[PDB]
Amino acid sequence: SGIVQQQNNLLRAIEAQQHLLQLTVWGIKQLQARIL
Amino acid sequence: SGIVQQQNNLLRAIEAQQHLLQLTVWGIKQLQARIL
Amino acid sequence: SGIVQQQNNLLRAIEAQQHLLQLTVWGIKQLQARIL
Amino acid sequence: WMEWDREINNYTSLIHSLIEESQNQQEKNEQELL
Amino acid sequence: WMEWDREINNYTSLIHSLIEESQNQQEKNEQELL
Amino acid sequence: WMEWDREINNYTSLIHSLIEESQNQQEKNEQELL
Numbered sequence: 001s002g003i004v005q006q007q008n009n010l011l012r013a014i015e016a017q018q019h020l021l022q023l024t025v026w027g028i029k030q031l032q033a034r035i036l
Numbered sequence: 037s038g039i040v041q042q043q044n045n046l047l048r049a050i051e052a053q054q055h056l057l058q059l060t061v062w063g064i065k066q067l068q069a070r071i072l
Numbered sequence: 073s074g075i076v077q078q079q080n081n082l083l084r085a086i087e088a089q090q091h092l093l094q095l096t097v098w099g100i101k102q103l104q105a106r107i108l
Numbered sequence: 109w110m111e112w113d114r115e116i117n118n119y120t121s122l123i124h125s126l127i128e129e130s131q132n133q134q135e136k137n138e139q140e141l142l
Numbered sequence: 143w144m145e146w147d148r149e150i151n152n153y154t155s156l157i158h159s160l161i162e163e164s165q166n167q168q169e170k171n172e173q174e175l176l
Numbered sequence: 177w178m179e180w181d182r183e184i185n186n187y188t189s190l191i192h193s194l195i196e197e198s199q200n201q202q203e204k205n206e207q208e209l210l
Contacts, residue, residue, distance in 0.1 A: 002171040004137050006079050007042050009167055011130050013086050013160040014049050018123055019153045020093050021056050023146055025116055027100040028063040030143075031107055035067055036109065038137040040205050043078050045133055047198050049126040050085050054191055055119045057092050059112055061184055064099040066109075071103055072177065074205040076171050081201055083164050085194040090157055091187045095180055097150055102177075108143065 001141060002167060002174055003039055003075055003079065004134075004141055006083075006164060006167045006171055007039065007046070007137070008134055009160055009164040010046055010079070010082055010086065011042075011127070011134055013157055013164065014046065014053065014130075015127055016153050016157040016160060017053060017086065017089060017093060018127060020097075020150065020157065021053060021060070021123075022120075023150055023153070024060050024093070024096050024100055025056075025063075027097075027104065027146060028060055028067070031067055031100070031103055032063065032109065035071055035107055037209060038133060038140055039075055040202075040209055042130060042133045042137055043075065043082070043205070044202055045126055045130040046082055047078075047195070047202055049123055049130065050082065050089065050198075051195055052119050052123040052126060053089060054195060056116065056123065057089060057096070057191075058188075059116055059119070060096050061092075061099075063112060064096055064103070067103055068099065068177065071107055073175060074201060074208055076168075076175055078198060078201045078205055079171070080168055081194055081198040083161070083168055085191055085198065086164075087161055088187050088191040088194060090161060092184065092191065093157075094154075095184055095187070099180060104143065
């Protein structure tokens with residue numbers, strides 16, 4: 001159970017990081033549009 | 037098995053995100069070279 | 073054990089990536105401060 | 109920059125599929141535990 | 143850009159909590175194995 | 177920016193090692209299941 005529980009915690013961590021990844025890409029494209 | 041299976045799915049997700057991380061760093065260094 | 077072991081390896085990978093995520097955000101805000 | 113764009117979408121699509129596959133296996137694994 | 147800032151801190155706080163929760167479950171799961 | 181560079185490579189090297197270690201444990205764990 002603790003393993004299935006930990007897996008859920010890891011998956012949620014990856015999904016959270018994925019949002020962060022999208023936000024940094026949005027930041028990069030915004031800055032690139034004005035500097036390219 | 038489902039746990040080992042899920043672990044594979046998580047690991048592949050992390051590796052995919054790692055590529056994304058590298059791409060954003062490449063974007064940042066490119067923009068930094070021209071703005072520094 | 074190998075599963076608990078793999079979970080540790082995944083968690084450390086996510087934490088490492090989180091540092092990378094913070095560093096790219098720092099890079100983005102730095103470049104944004106000078107281009108906004 | 110166009111290659112970076114395609115590589116950014118390519119990996120984003122693989123990550124979406126893996127996050128979704130994992131979401132499903134999470135439900136299945138929780139079911140199998142019960 | 144202010145929304146991006148808040149969204150960046152919002153997800154960073156959720157990731158900190160999940161990394162910390164996982165850190166604890168890692169210790170508990172290692173204990174249960176022994 | 178030079179510190180950021182070193183910190184970026186430092187974490188990239190730790191992530192490579194952990195992705196590789198995980199890749200190996202994935203094969204070992206799949207073997208142990210069979």
